[PDB]
């Protein structure tokens, strides 16, 4: 079975470089043309490059020509993507793919991508790494119809994704809901993580959200407590 595994992706600032690699197995690598295809968050598939079986020629998308180089090492069954002078519009998931035909594409013939890899994410942003500011979202004294009290944490203005939030050191998993983060106009992210608890407990028990932002190494525990009312 043909496997393609992409590697190298990261978070960089504009003008900087990366190199992606795509390691393969389950086929005679040197026989096929190989692709790079990307996908910008919320957008469609966009072809980046192709390289012939023997690497004798390579073709690029207009947007990338001159900043990107596709190359291959048929000895080590690996495909590279050298990405220079990276631009925020290059943010995406990068896939390698195999061309299913006879080593190239032409006016005669082009099979197209047959097997794909899993993707490696690339983020190019003007932002720098920022740890979050962590605020408790205290459980309201205002009753609600039902056996509900909601409390949470606000994980505000971080970069980059992701962040890890657990509750009571992950000893609480029941009725936690951590929402998808917003990407503010800042370039920074914010998320919220809520626990709906039976209002009887609120005050009988203690709730702390544990927030871990690996990229910054910002680890914060916020105790979330009923207001003095």
């Amino acid at each position: 079975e043909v496997q393609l595994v992409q590697s190298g992706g990261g978070v960089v600032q504009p003008g900087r470089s990366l190199r992606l690699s795509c390691s393969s197995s389950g086929f005679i690598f040197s026989s096929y043309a190989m692709y790079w295809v990307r996908q910008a968050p919320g957008k469609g598939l966009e072809w980046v490059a192709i390289i012939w079986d023997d690497g004798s020629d390579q073709h690029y998308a207009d947007s990338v020509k001159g900043r990107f180089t596709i190359s291959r090492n048929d000895s080590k069954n690996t495909l590279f993507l050298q990405m220079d002078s990276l631009r925020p519009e290059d943010t995406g998931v990068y896939f390698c793919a195999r061309d299913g035909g006879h080593g190239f594409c032409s006016s005669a013939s082009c099979f197209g991508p047959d097997y794909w890899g899993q993707g490696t994410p690339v983020t190019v942003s003007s932002a720098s790494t920022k740890g979050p500011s962590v605020f408790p979202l205290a459980p309201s004294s205002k009753s609600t119809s039902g056996g509900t009290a909601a409390l949470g944490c606000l994980v505000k203005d971080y970069f980059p994704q992701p962040v890890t939030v657990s509750w009571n050191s992950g000893a609480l998993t029941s009725g936690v809901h951590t929402f998808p983060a917003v990407l503010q106009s800042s370039g920074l992210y914010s998320l919220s993580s809520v626990v709906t608890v039976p209002s009887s407990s609120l005050g009988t028990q203690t709730y702390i959200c544990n927030v871990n932002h690996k990229p910054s190494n910002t680890k914060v525990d916020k105790r979330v407590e009923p207001k003095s009312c």
Binding site: S107, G112, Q118, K156, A181
Partner: protein, 216 residues
């Protein structure tokens, strides 16, 4: 030049025939064969149709392809729940020497019970007020379909600016979630009696209300 054109969406009820078109030029579809891919966003696509009308083994018989001139289509003959994904067509352009994707189509399997949203509203934290900032958070869960309209109101009046709202995102639930954040100054916050988050979903509007009344 750069793009195949697809309709942004195609829908139907389960068991119907749903087809997807893909409009190109002389230089790509007119010249070369067309592939179709099925993809869940950000995840690896999968080849569904190659060389206009061929199918790889494992692909269901209800998928067919067709091409003529500079146009191609995908047919789904008996729409099933599994078929809710993105679809791309693709082809090599002999003039540009490039491999061109279609702009892509989302399918939705029509019906599915409408689900009202759960609205949960938090006022600014004390500790964030000390930092001289204020965020109000409106969290909106367990809705279907994924189309909501969030408004912010202060006393009797629509809140101008400072609103960030996420685009709704499907849960494993098959229902949606969305957040909305209102940024103010602690003085704005404190200069009103009440703040509301109002969410309108399929002609129904839910409102939650918070007040600077911590122990007042």
């Amino acid at each position: 030049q750069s793009v195949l054109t697809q309709p942004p969406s195609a829908s139907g009820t389960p068991g119907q025939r749903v087809t997807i078109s893909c409009s190109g030029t002389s230089s790509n579809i007119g010249s070369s064969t067309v592939n179709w891919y099925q993809q869940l966003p950000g995840m690896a696509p999968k080849l569904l149709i190659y060389r206009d009308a061929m199918r790889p083994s494992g692909v269901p018989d209800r998928f067919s392809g067709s091409k003529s001139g500079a146009s191609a289509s995908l047919a789904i003959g008996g729409l099933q729940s599994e078929d809710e994904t993105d679809y791309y067509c693709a082809a090599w352009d002999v003039s540009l020497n490039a491999y061109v994707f279609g702009t892509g189509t989302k399918v939705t399997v029509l019906g599915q019970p409408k689900a009202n949203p759960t609205v949960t509203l938090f006022p600014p934290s004390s500790e964030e007020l000390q930092a001289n900032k204020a965020t109000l958070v409106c969290l909106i869960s367990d809705f279907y379909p994924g189309a909501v309209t969030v408004a912010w109101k202060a006393d009797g009046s629509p809140v101008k600016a400072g609103v960030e709202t996420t685009k709704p995102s499907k849960q494993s639930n098959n229902k949606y979630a969305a957040s909305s954040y209102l940024s103010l100054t602690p003085e704005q916050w404190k200069s009103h009696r009440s703040y509301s988050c109002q969410v309108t979903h399929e002609g129904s509007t839910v409102e939650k209300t918070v007040a600077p009344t911590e122990c007042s």
